[PDB]
Amino acid sequence: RRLKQKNARLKQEIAALEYEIAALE
Amino acid sequence: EIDALEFENDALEQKIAALKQKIASLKQ
């Protein structure tokens, strides 16, 4: 389903960004 | 019905924009 796929990818993107934030600090 | 995942997806996008901004800031 469109919305479940976009949900899973929004989560993966937030994960990548919190990873970089932690690397940057 | 606006689905419960549209709610959750729209909150997740907000969160994304806010993390990008924080990363923009840490680099400055």
mmCIF file of N, CA, C and O in Angstrom:
data_model
loop_
_atom_site.group_PDB
_atom_site.id
_atom_site.type_symbol
_atom_site.label_atom_id
_atom_site.label_comp_id
_atom_site.label_asym_id
_atom_site.label_seq_id
_atom_site.Cartn_x
_atom_site.Cartn_y
_atom_site.Cartn_z
ATOM 1 N N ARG A 1 0.851 -1.233 0.000
ATOM 2 C CA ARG A 1 0.000 0.000 0.000
ATOM 3 C C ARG A 1 0.873 1.265 0.000
ATOM 4 O O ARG A 1 1.797 1.375 0.802
ATOM 5 N N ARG A 2 0.573 2.207 -0.901
ATOM 6 C CA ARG A 2 1.215 3.530 -0.963
ATOM 7 C C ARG A 2 1.625 4.070 0.440
ATOM 8 O O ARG A 2 2.774 4.431 0.657
ATOM 9 N N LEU A 3 0.679 4.089 1.374
ATOM 10 C CA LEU A 3 0.860 4.809 2.620
ATOM 11 C C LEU A 3 1.799 4.068 3.590
ATOM 12 O O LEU A 3 2.515 4.690 4.318
ATOM 13 N N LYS A 4 1.747 2.749 3.595
ATOM 14 C CA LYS A 4 2.625 1.923 4.401
ATOM 15 C C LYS A 4 4.087 1.993 3.889
ATOM 16 O O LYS A 4 5.016 2.029 4.695
ATOM 17 N N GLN A 5 4.260 2.032 2.563
ATOM 18 C CA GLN A 5 5.557 2.193 1.897
ATOM 19 C C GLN A 5 6.152 3.537 2.147
ATOM 20 O O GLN A 5 7.295 3.619 2.505
ATOM 21 N N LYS A 6 5.388 4.596 1.946
ATOM 22 C CA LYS A 6 5.846 5.914 2.359
ATOM 23 C C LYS A 6 6.166 6.042 3.897
ATOM 24 O O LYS A 6 7.092 6.721 4.285
ATOM 25 N N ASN A 7 5.370 5.417 4.743
ATOM 26 C CA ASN A 7 5.663 5.340 6.173
ATOM 27 C C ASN A 7 7.038 4.669 6.448
ATOM 28 O O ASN A 7 7.901 5.251 7.129
ATOM 29 N N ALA A 8 7.243 3.469 5.897
ATOM 30 C CA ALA A 8 8.510 2.763 6.091
ATOM 31 C C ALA A 8 9.721 3.599 5.623
ATOM 32 O O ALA A 8 10.704 3.660 6.334
ATOM 33 N N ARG A 9 9.589 4.324 4.515
ATOM 34 C CA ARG A 9 10.639 5.211 3.985
ATOM 35 C C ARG A 9 10.785 6.523 4.722
ATOM 36 O O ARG A 9 11.899 7.052 4.826
ATOM 37 N N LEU A 10 9.689 7.047 5.284
ATOM 38 C CA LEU A 10 9.859 8.215 6.160
ATOM 39 C C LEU A 10 10.620 7.856 7.417
ATOM 40 O O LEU A 10 11.462 8.618 7.849
ATOM 41 N N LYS A 11 10.354 6.676 7.972
ATOM 42 C CA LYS A 11 11.090 6.174 9.146
ATOM 43 C C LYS A 11 12.572 5.965 8.861
ATOM 44 O O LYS A 11 13.401 6.316 9.687
ATOM 45 N N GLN A 12 12.902 5.409 7.695
ATOM 46 C CA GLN A 12 14.302 5.153 7.296
ATOM 47 C C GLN A 12 15.104 6.414 7.094
ATOM 48 O O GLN A 12 16.286 6.494 7.445
ATOM 49 N N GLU A 13 14.430 7.427 6.591
ATOM 50 C CA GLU A 13 14.987 8.739 6.428
ATOM 51 C C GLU A 13 15.234 9.440 7.766
ATOM 52 O O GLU A 13 16.252 10.069 7.949
ATOM 53 N N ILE A 14 14.305 9.342 8.697
ATOM 54 C CA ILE A 14 14.478 9.916 10.000
ATOM 55 C C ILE A 14 15.640 9.176 10.677
ATOM 56 O O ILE A 14 16.476 9.796 11.306
ATOM 57 N N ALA A 15 15.697 7.847 10.563
ATOM 58 C CA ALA A 15 16.850 7.094 11.084
ATOM 59 C C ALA A 15 18.224 7.578 10.557
ATOM 60 O O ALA A 15 19.176 7.722 11.313
ATOM 61 N N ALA A 16 18.307 7.868 9.273
ATOM 62 C CA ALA A 16 19.552 8.292 8.656
ATOM 63 C C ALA A 16 19.942 9.623 9.170
ATOM 64 O O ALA A 16 21.117 9.877 9.388
ATOM 65 N N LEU A 17 18.957 10.500 9.365
ATOM 66 C CA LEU A 17 19.244 11.839 9.837
ATOM 67 C C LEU A 17 19.642 11.858 11.281
ATOM 68 O O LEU A 17 20.542 12.634 11.631
ATOM 69 N N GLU A 18 18.994 11.038 12.128
ATOM 70 C CA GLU A 18 19.432 10.960 13.529
ATOM 71 C C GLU A 18 20.827 10.311 13.639
ATOM 72 O O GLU A 18 21.620 10.711 14.492
ATOM 73 N N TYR A 19 21.124 9.326 12.782
ATOM 74 C CA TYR A 19 22.509 8.843 12.655
ATOM 75 C C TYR A 19 23.527 9.973 12.345
ATOM 76 O O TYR A 19 24.526 10.131 13.024
ATOM 77 N N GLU A 20 23.289 10.754 11.306
ATOM 78 C CA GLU A 20 24.210 11.835 10.998
ATOM 79 C C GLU A 20 24.325 12.855 12.150
ATOM 80 O O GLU A 20 25.408 13.335 12.462
ATOM 81 N N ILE A 21 23.214 13.179 12.792
ATOM 82 C CA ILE A 21 23.219 14.133 13.903
ATOM 83 C C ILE A 21 24.161 13.668 15.004
ATOM 84 O O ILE A 21 25.047 14.417 15.425
ATOM 85 N N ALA A 22 24.031 12.402 15.376
ATOM 86 C CA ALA A 22 24.905 11.806 16.357
ATOM 87 C C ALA A 22 26.372 11.745 15.927
ATOM 88 O O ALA A 22 27.253 11.814 16.775
ATOM 89 N N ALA A 23 26.637 11.556 14.630
ATOM 90 C CA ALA A 23 28.015 11.592 14.109
ATOM 91 C C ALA A 23 28.607 13.004 14.165
ATOM 92 O O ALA A 23 29.818 13.177 14.405
ATOM 93 N N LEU A 24 27.755 14.005 13.958
ATOM 94 C CA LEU A 24 28.167 15.400 13.829
ATOM 95 C C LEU A 24 28.491 16.049 15.151
ATOM 96 O O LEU A 24 29.151 17.098 15.179
ATOM 97 N N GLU A 25 27.992 15.464 16.238
ATOM 98 C CA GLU A 25 28.054 16.108 17.527
ATOM 99 C C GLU A 25 29.272 15.601 18.326
ATOM 100 O O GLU A 25 29.174 14.693 19.164
ATOM 101 N N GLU B 1 -12.235 8.424 4.555
ATOM 102 C CA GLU B 1 -11.612 8.642 5.879
ATOM 103 C C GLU B 1 -10.187 9.048 5.586
ATOM 104 O O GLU B 1 -9.526 8.417 4.736
ATOM 105 N N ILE B 2 -9.713 10.113 6.238
ATOM 106 C CA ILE B 2 -8.268 10.379 6.264
ATOM 107 C C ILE B 2 -7.689 9.299 7.169
ATOM 108 O O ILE B 2 -8.085 9.162 8.329
ATOM 109 N N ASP B 3 -6.778 8.508 6.628
ATOM 110 C CA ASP B 3 -6.303 7.345 7.329
ATOM 111 C C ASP B 3 -5.357 7.740 8.467
ATOM 112 O O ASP B 3 -4.615 8.710 8.340
ATOM 113 N N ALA B 4 -5.342 6.948 9.533
ATOM 114 C CA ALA B 4 -4.369 7.119 10.645
ATOM 115 C C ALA B 4 -2.900 7.207 10.201
ATOM 116 O O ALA B 4 -2.098 7.946 10.792
ATOM 117 N N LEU B 5 -2.540 6.521 9.120
ATOM 118 C CA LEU B 5 -1.175 6.691 8.546
ATOM 119 C C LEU B 5 -0.911 8.011 7.851
ATOM 120 O O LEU B 5 0.255 8.396 7.734
ATOM 121 N N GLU B 6 -1.942 8.712 7.379
ATOM 122 C CA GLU B 6 -1.705 10.047 6.832
ATOM 123 C C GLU B 6 -1.301 10.985 7.950
ATOM 124 O O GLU B 6 -0.401 11.790 7.806
ATOM 125 N N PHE B 7 -2.004 10.898 9.066
ATOM 126 C CA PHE B 7 -1.595 11.573 10.290
ATOM 127 C C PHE B 7 -0.171 11.284 10.644
ATOM 128 O O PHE B 7 0.603 12.197 10.824
ATOM 129 N N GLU B 8 0.165 10.003 10.771
ATOM 130 C CA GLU B 8 1.495 9.594 11.180
ATOM 131 C C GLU B 8 2.522 10.025 10.111
ATOM 132 O O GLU B 8 3.523 10.641 10.434
ATOM 133 N N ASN B 9 2.239 9.796 8.843
ATOM 134 C CA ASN B 9 3.170 10.288 7.784
ATOM 135 C C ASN B 9 3.429 11.803 7.821
ATOM 136 O O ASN B 9 4.558 12.245 7.705
ATOM 137 N N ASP B 10 2.387 12.607 8.002
ATOM 138 C CA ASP B 10 2.552 14.060 8.134
ATOM 139 C C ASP B 10 3.322 14.546 9.377
ATOM 140 O O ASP B 10 4.106 15.489 9.310
ATOM 141 N N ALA B 11 3.134 13.894 10.516
ATOM 142 C CA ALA B 11 4.006 14.125 11.643
ATOM 143 C C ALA B 11 5.514 13.745 11.347
ATOM 144 O O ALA B 11 6.422 14.495 11.698
ATOM 145 N N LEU B 12 5.744 12.625 10.647
ATOM 146 C CA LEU B 12 7.101 12.151 10.291
ATOM 147 C C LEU B 12 7.809 13.084 9.341
ATOM 148 O O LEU B 12 9.004 13.322 9.498
ATOM 149 N N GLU B 13 7.084 13.642 8.379
ATOM 150 C CA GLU B 13 7.631 14.700 7.485
ATOM 151 C C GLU B 13 8.032 15.979 8.226
ATOM 152 O O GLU B 13 9.136 16.503 8.012
ATOM 153 N N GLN B 14 7.167 16.473 9.110
ATOM 154 C CA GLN B 14 7.530 17.564 10.034
ATOM 155 C C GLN B 14 8.841 17.233 10.742
ATOM 156 O O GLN B 14 9.795 18.020 10.706
ATOM 157 N N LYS B 15 8.892 16.073 11.377
ATOM 158 C CA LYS B 15 10.099 15.672 12.085
ATOM 159 C C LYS B 15 11.337 15.689 11.172
ATOM 160 O O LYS B 15 12.373 16.203 11.547
ATOM 161 N N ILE B 16 11.208 15.157 9.967
ATOM 162 C CA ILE B 16 12.257 15.234 8.958
ATOM 163 C C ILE B 16 12.764 16.665 8.657
ATOM 164 O O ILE B 16 13.994 16.920 8.631
ATOM 165 N N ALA B 17 11.836 17.583 8.412
ATOM 166 C CA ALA B 17 12.203 18.966 8.128
ATOM 167 C C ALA B 17 12.941 19.558 9.310
ATOM 168 O O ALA B 17 13.888 20.347 9.126
ATOM 169 N N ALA B 18 12.522 19.184 10.511
ATOM 170 C CA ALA B 18 13.183 19.695 11.716
ATOM 171 C C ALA B 18 14.589 19.068 11.928
ATOM 172 O O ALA B 18 15.500 19.730 12.430
ATOM 173 N N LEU B 19 14.776 17.801 11.540
ATOM 174 C CA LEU B 19 16.130 17.217 11.631
ATOM 175 C C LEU B 19 17.097 17.771 10.561
ATOM 176 O O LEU B 19 18.243 18.060 10.853
ATOM 177 N N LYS B 20 16.611 17.978 9.347
ATOM 178 C CA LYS B 20 17.417 18.651 8.339
ATOM 179 C C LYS B 20 17.927 20.034 8.763
ATOM 180 O O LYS B 20 19.021 20.440 8.373
ATOM 181 N N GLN B 21 17.114 20.744 9.535
ATOM 182 C CA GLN B 21 17.374 22.123 9.957
ATOM 183 C C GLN B 21 18.437 22.113 11.050
ATOM 184 O O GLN B 21 19.357 22.940 11.056
ATOM 185 N N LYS B 22 18.288 21.152 11.965
ATOM 186 C CA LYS B 22 19.259 20.890 12.972
ATOM 187 C C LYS B 22 20.612 20.484 12.337
ATOM 188 O O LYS B 22 21.674 20.915 12.782
ATOM 189 N N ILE B 23 20.578 19.692 11.275
ATOM 190 C CA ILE B 23 21.838 19.355 10.590
ATOM 191 C C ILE B 23 22.439 20.579 9.864
ATOM 192 O O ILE B 23 23.647 20.807 9.935
ATOM 193 N N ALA B 24 21.603 21.333 9.148
ATOM 194 C CA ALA B 24 21.988 22.662 8.613
ATOM 195 C C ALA B 24 22.626 23.562 9.658
ATOM 196 O O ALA B 24 23.596 24.280 9.373
ATOM 197 N N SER B 25 22.100 23.512 10.871
ATOM 198 C CA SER B 25 22.637 24.304 11.972
ATOM 199 C C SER B 25 24.002 23.798 12.470
ATOM 200 O O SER B 25 24.920 24.584 12.642
ATOM 201 N N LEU B 26 24.147 22.493 12.688
ATOM 202 C CA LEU B 26 25.400 21.954 13.201
ATOM 203 C C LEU B 26 26.573 22.204 12.247
ATOM 204 O O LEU B 26 27.718 22.259 12.680
ATOM 205 N N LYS B 27 26.283 22.302 10.956
ATOM 206 C CA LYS B 27 27.281 22.635 9.940
ATOM 207 C C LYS B 27 27.439 24.166 9.829
ATOM 208 O O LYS B 27 28.549 24.671 9.696
ATOM 209 N N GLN B 28 26.306 24.872 9.880
ATOM 210 C CA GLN B 28 26.199 26.344 9.873
ATOM 211 C C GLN B 28 26.890 27.012 8.686
ATOM 212 O O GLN B 28 26.315 27.095 7.592
#
